[PDB]
Amino acid sequence: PLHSIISSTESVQGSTSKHEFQAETKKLLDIVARSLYSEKEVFIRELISNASDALEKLRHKLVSDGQALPEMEIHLQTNAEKGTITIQDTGIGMTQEELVSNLFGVGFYSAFMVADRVEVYSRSAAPGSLGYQWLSDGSGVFEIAEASGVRTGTKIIIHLKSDCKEFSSEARVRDVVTKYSNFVSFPLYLNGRRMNTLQAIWMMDPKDVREWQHEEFYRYVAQAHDKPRYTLHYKTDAPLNIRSIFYVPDMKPSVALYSRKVLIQTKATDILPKWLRFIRGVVDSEDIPLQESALIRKLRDVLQQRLIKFFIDQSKKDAEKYAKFFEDYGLFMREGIVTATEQEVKEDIAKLLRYESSALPSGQLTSLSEYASRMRNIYYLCAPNRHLAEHSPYYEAMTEVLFCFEQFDELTLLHLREFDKKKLISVET
Ligand SMILES: Nc1nc(Cl)c2nc(O)n(Cc3ccc(Br)cc3F)c2n1
């Protein structure tokens, strides 16, 4: 199973030319290495992502021009003795100008957070392209030389800081890799061993997903053995860039925050209203950078609205299955209603609520709007059982009414004092 492509074939025959970019870039650079990211291990993530993006560029072009595909792999090698960590990719390399002009690569710089000396070799995938070597110690001055024996792609060799040698250990690197890069879009190896094994299905055309795939991914993100009770595959580009999958568990009573097929936070509870905390799955957007009160709240609402409609349409696609779901999760809806501030938010959430009707036969649950059809005001009755609710003289004088058999349901109706073109009033007035 041993497989590695990283070895020291490159070399520079001549001398290098020294460069020092402008003071501002120097500041932005010291900023990236000191205060940009809150975690240091994430450098393994950023570089990996950059490699993946480069490989697609090659594949997309080799296909757009109809040529055979080479080995599109991503390799990471640790050296504890030399205290080094290397990452190489076959993805279409960088030109000489690029290696000088750039500064995308905003994430490549993250390495200086852990490295005191960075060493790079690149060879643009275009034929007849030359390989070049890029050196730097983080002081704002880099060297460029023409290198030989450079394979098409990019190779990065990091000489860790005296205190960051922990990464040079394989086990540590694999922990980080499996933490962030478990869904990378290209084969990834670490000292020879393939690490990733998961497909980020949340990027596929929803019409091209299979049920067993959703079950596997649900059991991963949720870490359960039951199957999904409900599944929502949401892609959006008009409000914001969203690619997510939401699962309602089969068993009765969090969501991951990915981006560019790489994970930022595993418990992105902010992305969904607190009353929807029972949802599992993933949400992936290109709009996110250990604190979150950001404007991404708009996302938190786009999802809140989208999920509501999803739960409404489901009620109209299967009433008994949704009835079981509501009997199992209505606690959250009533909570989110009692907690909502704008009455519009409450009424939106309340559209999921279902009750038994005086005109409907016992055992039938209806939404507020559905009852609204037969109508100038809504009227309910909080009684223990259907027999008691029908026998009720308060009801005996009748036109159509709804029945509550639990105290929290009555309190819920009393919280949202009104609904749409209606007013919620107790028959026991
Ligand atoms: N990994 C990878 N692969 C490819 Cl093809 C890239 N093209 C880029 O512009 N960057 C970012 C970048 C800019 C300057 C320097 Br020095 C290094 C570096 F990585 C790439 N990174």
Q: Evaluate: CB of 53 within 6 angstroms of ligand 1.
A: no
Q: How far is the C-alpha of 89 from the C-alpha of 154, rounded, in Å?
A: 6
Exposure of 67 by Cβ count < 10 A (0-12 exposed, 13-18 middle, 19+ buried)? exposed
Number of neighbouring beta carbons within 10 Å of residue 314: 17
Residue with tokens 């309340």: 350
Per DSSP, the three-state class of 132 is strand
Tell me which residue has its CA closest to atom 11 in ligand 1.
105
Q: How far is the C-alpha of 262 from the C-alpha of 165, rounded, in Å?
A: 24
196 annotated binding-site participant: no
Q: How far is the C-alpha of 125 from the C-alpha of 129, rounded, in Å?
A: 7
- State the method: X-ray
Tell me which residue has its CA closest to atom 13 in ligand 1.
105
Q: How far is the C-alpha of 46 from the C-alpha of 247, rounded, in Å?
A: 29
Q: In 102-253, which residue ranges form alpha helices assigned H by DSSP? A: 170-180, 211-222
Q: How far is the C-alpha of 395 from the C-alpha of 401, rounded, in Å?
A: 8
Q: Evaluate: CB of 93 within 6 angstroms of ligand 1.
A: yes
Closest Cα to residue 237, out of 284, 201, 194? 284
CATH fold of 11-194 reads Heat Shock Protein 90 (3.30.565)
Pairing status of strand 378-382 against strand 424-426: parallel
Nearest ligand 1 atom to the CA of 105 is 11
Strand 242-249: give its sheet, edge to edge: 228-236, 242-249, 280-284, 256-259, 262-265
Cα of 357 vs centre of ligand 1, distance in Å, is 65
Q: How far is the C-alpha of 117 from the C-alpha of 115, rounded, in Å?
A: 6
Q: Evaluate: CB of 138 within 6 angstroms of ligand 1.
A: no
Q: Evaluate: CB of 107 within 6 angstroms of ligand 1.
A: no
* Interruption sites in the chain after residues (C→N beyond 2.5 Å): 103, 253, 289, 375, 398
360-371 per-residue burial string, b: 16 or more CB within 10 A, e: under 16? beeeebbbbeeb
Tell me which residue has its CA closest to atom 16 in ligand 1.
99
Q: List the Cα angle 413/418/422 in 5-degree steps.
A: 115
Q: Evaluate: CB of 51 within 6 angstroms of ligand 1.
A: yes
- Rounded to 10 degrees, the C-alpha dihedral 224/227/229/234 comes to 80
Q: Evaluate: CB of 91 within 6 angstroms of ligand 1.
A: yes
Q: How far is the C-alpha of 412 from the C-alpha of 353, rounded, in Å?
A: 10
241 annotated binding-site participant: no
Residue with tokens 């460029």: 144
Q: What would the two tokens of residue 116 be?
A: 């005191």
* Non-local CB neighbours of 395 within 8 Å, separated by 6+ positions: 358, 381, 389, 401, 427
Closest Cα to residue 284, out of 250, 311, 252, 244? 244
Closest Cα to residue 274, out of 294, 252, 258, 297? 297
Q: Evaluate: CB of 108 within 6 angstroms of ligand 1.
A: yes
Identity (one letter) of the amino acid at 393?
P
Q: Evaluate: CB of 113 within 6 angstroms of ligand 1.
A: no
Q: How far is the C-alpha of 330 from the C-alpha of 349, rounded, in Å?
A: 11
Cβ proximity of 413 and 424 under 8 Å: yes
102 annotated binding-site participant: yes
How far is the CA of 235 from the CAs of 57, 160, 184, in angstroms?
23, 40, 19
Cβ proximity of 300 and 276 under 8 Å: no
Cβ proximity of 200 and 220 under 8 Å: no
Cα of 113 vs centre of ligand 1, distance in Å, is 17
Final resolution, Å: 3.0
